[PDB]
Subunit: 106 residues, 3 copies
Amino acid sequence: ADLEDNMETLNDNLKVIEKADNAAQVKDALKKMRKAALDAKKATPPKLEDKSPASPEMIDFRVGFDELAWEIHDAAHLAEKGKVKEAQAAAEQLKTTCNACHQKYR
Amino acid sequence: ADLEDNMETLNDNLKVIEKADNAAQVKDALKKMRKAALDAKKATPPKLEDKSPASPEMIDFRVGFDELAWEIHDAAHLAEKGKVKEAQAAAEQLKTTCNACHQKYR
Amino acid sequence: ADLEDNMETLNDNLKVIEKADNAAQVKDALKKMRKAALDAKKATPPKLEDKSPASPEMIDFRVGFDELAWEIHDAAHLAEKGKVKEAQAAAEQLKTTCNACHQKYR
Ligand code: HEC
Ligand code: HEC
Ligand code: HEC
Ligand SMILES: [Ca+2]
Ligand SMILES: [Ca+2]
Ligand SMILES: [Ca+2]
Ligand SMILES: [Ca+2]
Ligand SMILES: [Ca+2]
Ligand SMILES: [Ca+2]
Ligand SMILES: [Ca+2]
Ligand SMILES: [Ca+2]
Ligand SMILES: [Ca+2]
Ligand SMILES: [Cl-]
Ligand SMILES: [Cl-]
Ligand SMILES: [Cl-]
Ligand SMILES: [Cl-]
Ligand SMILES: [Cl-]
Ligand SMILES: [Mn+2]
């Protein structure tokens, strides 16, 4: 999928997690975020189309999705230990990672 | 190890997992797959030797191993909860990720 | 942070883990290592400054941090099951991955 669709998947599943009522809903949404995050990592964002494909900005951009994916996995660890409300709080904390990339490249 | 060796390791351990009799055999084989997947990520496949090293195809290629490593990890989570049959089924499902890359770059 | 700050973080938290007294201290230190590992992945090490940004050495370098992050996570799994001493042993074993990269690019 393209970058925008992957971002909407990220945003949609954050709101699913917030409203989720059991561990299985959280874990399924988190899996969809991780998939979207890895798929977004294949893209060139519009503000970096003029840079080299392995410029430090494109590397930083791509590693940003590794960091997002690992943080998502931390939340997944909380959810499958049954710590649903802790997992939902960790999901909401992902926004600091969303924001950090946006302020640089969005 | 070179790309072909890593691919044989991936294929060999898929069959070890299929025939495994306990969680420890599944976990050990999945670990060897993840290692092989990350090692394969360092290579240039023959069909992409003419593209630039960070072309969209080489990025798609490299991220394909991230996707495979995470999917392997999902199976390891099943095997660590002692859900051996589920872990074996998830390992069989990895083939859709194997295939998807092959049809583009093999 | 820059590359050498991330390396000091990696080295400091290895010593924290060696001296840790409970799972929480191991888990917290491992997570600082993973973060530092992914951040170091964004850098160009002095010995590769003259190489192409996606040369096979820079790819090998960056994948070295994926391998390090996954090995850290393996130790994190041990510590999350309360196997504190096994987690500490695995953290010591990380040094073979530290060394392997240093001998090539440090
Ligand atoms: C891309 C992201 C890939 C993923 C994921 C997997 N494979 Fe693969 N494979 C890929 C390429 C580009 C090649 C060509 C290698 C060459 O130099 O010819 C291959 C090759 C194989 C082979 C045959 C290797 C040989 O005998 O010479 C096998 C058996 C194989 N791949 C298996 C395999 C499996 C089981 C995977 C998932 C678990 C898998 N591959 C992932 C690219 C990619
Ligand atoms: C590559 C894939 C590496 C891995 C994995 C690890 N390190 Fe590293 N390290 C690497 C380089 C290229 C450098 C040179 C940095 C420079 O700017 O000169 C380093 C450096 C260090 C240092 C010294 C840093 C300093 O004090 O200036 C230390 C203490 C260090 N590295 C430790 C370390 C540990 C403990 C690792 C594993 C847990 C590790 N490194 C991994 C490249 C790579
Ligand atoms: C970089 C490493 C990013 C991370 C991590 C996240 N996002 Fe992002 N996002 C990024 C870019 C470069 C763009 C611009 C895309 C474009 O083509 O214009 C975006 C965009 C979005 C959007 C808007 C998409 C749209 O509706 O057109 C949303 C809603 C969005 N991003 C949300 C989002 C969330 C919730 C993230 C993590 C929790 C996140 N993004 C991570 C770059 C990066
Ligand atoms: Ca896509
Ligand atoms: Ca839009
Ligand atoms: Ca609800
Ligand atoms: Ca190799
Ligand atoms: Ca058997
Ligand atoms: Ca677990
Ligand atoms: Ca940094
Ligand atoms: Ca120093
Ligand atoms: Ca110094
Ligand atoms: Cl996850
Ligand atoms: Cl790259
Ligand atoms: Cl990468
Ligand atoms: Cl794994
Ligand atoms: Cl971890
Ligand atoms: Mn895990």
